[PDB]
Ligand binder design. Sequence first.
Ligand SMILES: [Zn+2]
Length: 648
Amino acid sequence: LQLRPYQMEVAQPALDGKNIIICLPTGSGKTRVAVYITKDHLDKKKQASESGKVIVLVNKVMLAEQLFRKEFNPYLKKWYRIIGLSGDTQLKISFPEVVKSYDVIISTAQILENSLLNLESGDDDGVQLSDFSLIIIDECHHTNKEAVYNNIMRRYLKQKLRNNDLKKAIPLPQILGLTASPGVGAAKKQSEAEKHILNICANLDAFTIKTVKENLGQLKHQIKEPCKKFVIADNPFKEKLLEIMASIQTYCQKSPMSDFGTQHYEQWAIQMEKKAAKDGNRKDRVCAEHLRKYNEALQINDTIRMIDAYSHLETFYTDEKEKKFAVLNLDETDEFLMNLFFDNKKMLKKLAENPEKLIKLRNTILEQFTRSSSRGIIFTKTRQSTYALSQWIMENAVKAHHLIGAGHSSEVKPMTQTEQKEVISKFRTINLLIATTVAGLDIKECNIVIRYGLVTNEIAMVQARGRARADESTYVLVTSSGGVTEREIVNDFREKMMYKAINRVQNMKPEEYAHKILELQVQSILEKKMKVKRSIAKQYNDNPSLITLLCKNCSMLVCSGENIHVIEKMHHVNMTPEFKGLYIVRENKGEIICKCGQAWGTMMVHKGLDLPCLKIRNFVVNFPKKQYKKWVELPIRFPDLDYSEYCL
RNA sequence: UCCAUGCGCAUGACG
RNA sequence: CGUCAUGCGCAUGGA
Ligand SMILES: [Zn+2]
């Protein structure tokens, strides 16, 4: 470990009290400095012989594993106890004990919160902040009054004001805080920005920001920002489909009040889908669903090879066929829509073969294929775009590979942490990555960062500029010109603004600063209390059975309220095979489907039972016709299951 | 190592 | 407040 000069002074006040913030660019290696603040705090406590604890926090697991790999252990391997925690790395020994041991802690946020709640919520193990003498944080810009991290700072604040009302005194920890450029939220002025910054600091109860101004020279030596650059590159098939859409409006008497190829049409479609669900009618929500599909097909067609819309609707309508045949094992509505499609499908694929939207960016990348293209990065919005384009390039054009996140959403096969690590290792050796907004991932040396239809804020901008370092960092920014370049411009604008604001706040009276931060702290606390009041008022009924669940295409009875049961206190289910007389089953490569053709759920095979579980998205309520997308919205409760019932 | 599920959060666009 | 897309964390159950 070592204490680079620009790191020295910025750390300096923290060494004695001084709950602060630090914000520095990429490359400065702000972990090493943090290690010094630790070690010096620890050594101070040993000089005092008192409880020296650190309870480091992050947002992501990967950084925790990283710092347990690289930074904290290899400099504190000798003296002190460390442990690299995470919600997923199974730890046999529970959290309060690794507080009772393990002087140093890497961790991850909501671990802590959960332990605190078990302290306050139930008679469980529990833990409090009083067991500490320091907290350290990373990426403070994710701090707000809403999220985690942190809610718990509002506990720090509440307890602090308890201490102050006592003084106007049990101890409380120092609070460091680190970050990149803190950015700024939802401004057009300096004053709104400054107010944001003050909200940040007083969410941390800190004292200053304390950036670097003196030793900018060695910094700029280590930090060589690449060139801020812009680059841009920018039919009857579309029309062929728009005609059908209008034909279907005629078939349905649906008035868009807007155009095709935007979110507005989609949103109106969803609203009509609710109303037609609030009517239990047909050609009225069913066609909202279809038209959602069509509009998605459009707005990919405006950006994506129309072969991929053919793929999308191949998937869709082929699944429609399979649904209707597993149900057979069709009416005017389905027959009209399906045949309206199939009469054209083949010729539409023929059109799909034919080459603005279709000739795109071949030169935009082959320029660098010819210049160097060793390294490659691509951003975009979506998942499906990535798979699609990687397929398209593997067919037409450089060996490539995709990348996306992890979550269970979008009706896609997601990826896995492991396989992400695989990919980034291969890239530390693949030439070009295709990614969504994922890239706190360790990458560098690159040159050809680009942007295929992006929006994102200043921080994603500068952090993407952190990766492709000072070697021909040709930042492209693609978009069909018909204000996306405006977004890079405003990112520059905010980059100016945060500096202009930091300067205006570093240079401030301590008294006035204290008054402002005190008022923001009290505001945040009072708002949390209002939140808790409204929230406690939220759930009130808790009724066993007041309802009937119905199919939403056919307004048909599907379940009552008391016949339902629960498992895991998560999933709902209906035994009582009177119900079982209804449904149909499907699987390919299981799923419950309808007598009409609606999708209903999954045959959850657990606990030695084929419990038929369902999803309330797909059903509709009758206590007003209401839809929720999740069970928890109503308060009215259902029982937990009794296996003695299933006595044979 | 993989699969299934619930919950909460932020971001950006949109009304 | 509602919609969409993206990303993150936690908690369950199974192989
Ligand atoms: Zn039905």
